[PDB]
Design a protein around this nucleic acid. Structure first.
Length: 271
DNA sequence: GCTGATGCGACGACGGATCC
DNA sequence: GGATCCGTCGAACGCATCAGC
């Protein structure tokens, strides 16, 4: 069945107005994404902060359009050995207080940015691989990432966004039965997600607001016209510290924005 | 400099078995 | 014998390198 994201809820359940708009997007090739008008969609969304994953592009090769974003002028980029794979980016209206890269362990998968009242982490979580060939590495990465997140020295609440490369529960993908042995829906990856929520701790912004809504995905394989059929997976998330839930206005899935095999997601917080 | 081949990374459609 | 379950296989993309000119 197709899906239509509900209207933007820009007021917290208590009645306060959203003051921060964050957008996260696995662009699957930043230069390709830019040629497919991805940046015109970003300008329409007008977020305060924009996080990109799988840019596959070192900094010296960022297209000039990225220098013409006056509302997103503080930009931090991180790329891996394997040029052309992985790579993440964080663009912000306001300068962060602090920026770092990695999870303490140059893989180009994580950017950490401390703002006035919260710490933002954007992540491109390693894929378990076709045939699960890198599933054990993923499991080790999950555990190191949890530890890193828990151990963040700031007593500030946490927002974690990006492509976490797992559909947490059967409601998070179209074909759960035939994918329980595929990357992104193994019992090992699902358990790692549950442990991330438990240990840090974190809530899944979208599922907390829409706990029973099926067919909401953020990824569709390019092949077999899966997107047109909405055969997809929910792989991209905003996860929030418990204390941030009263500030949570909405968590969106921008199903119609093209340019990649993932669609943008967007968080509204009242801070 | 530019093109196209090739390599590499990132599952839904389908065919067959089992079950009541 | 429709529903389900299971394992097998080809395929849309982006980016790097390489060969050729």
């Amino acid at each position: 069945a197709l899906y239509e994201d509900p209207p933007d809820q820009k007021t917290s359940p208590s009645g306060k107005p959203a003051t921060l708009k964050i957008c996260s997007w696995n662009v699957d090739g930043l230069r390709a994404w830019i040629k497919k008008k991805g940046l015109d969609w970003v300008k329409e969304e007008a977020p305060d902060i924009l996080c990109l994953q799988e840019t596959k592009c070192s900094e010296n090769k960022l297209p000039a359009e990225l220098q013409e974003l006056p509302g997103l002028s503080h930009q931090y980029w991180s790329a891996p050995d394997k040029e052309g794979y992985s790579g993440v980016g964080l663009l912000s209206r306001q300068a962060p207080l602090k920026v770092s890269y990695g999870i303490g362990d140059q893989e180009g998968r994580v950017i950490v940015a401390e703002f006035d009242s919260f710490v933002l982490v954007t992540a491109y979580v390693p894929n378990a691989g076709r045939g699960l060939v890198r599933l054990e590495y993923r499991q080790r990465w999950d555990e190191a990432f949890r530890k890193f997140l828990k151990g963040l020295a700031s007593r500030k609440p946490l927002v974690l966004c990006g492509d976490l490369n797992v559909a947490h529960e059967e409601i998070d993908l179209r074909n759960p039965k035939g994918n329980k042995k595929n990357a992104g829906f193994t019992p090992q990856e699902r358990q790692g997600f549950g442990e991330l929520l438990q240990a840090v701790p974190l809530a899944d912004s979208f599922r907390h607001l829409y706990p029973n809504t099926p067919y909401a995905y953020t990824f569709w394989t390019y092949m077999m016209n899966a997107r047109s059929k909405n055969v997809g997976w929910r792989l991209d998330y905003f996860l929030l510290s418990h204390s941030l839930l009263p500030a949570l206005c909405d968590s969106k899935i921008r199903s119609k924005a093209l340019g990649s095999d993932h669609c943008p997601i967007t968080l509204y917080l009242a801070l």
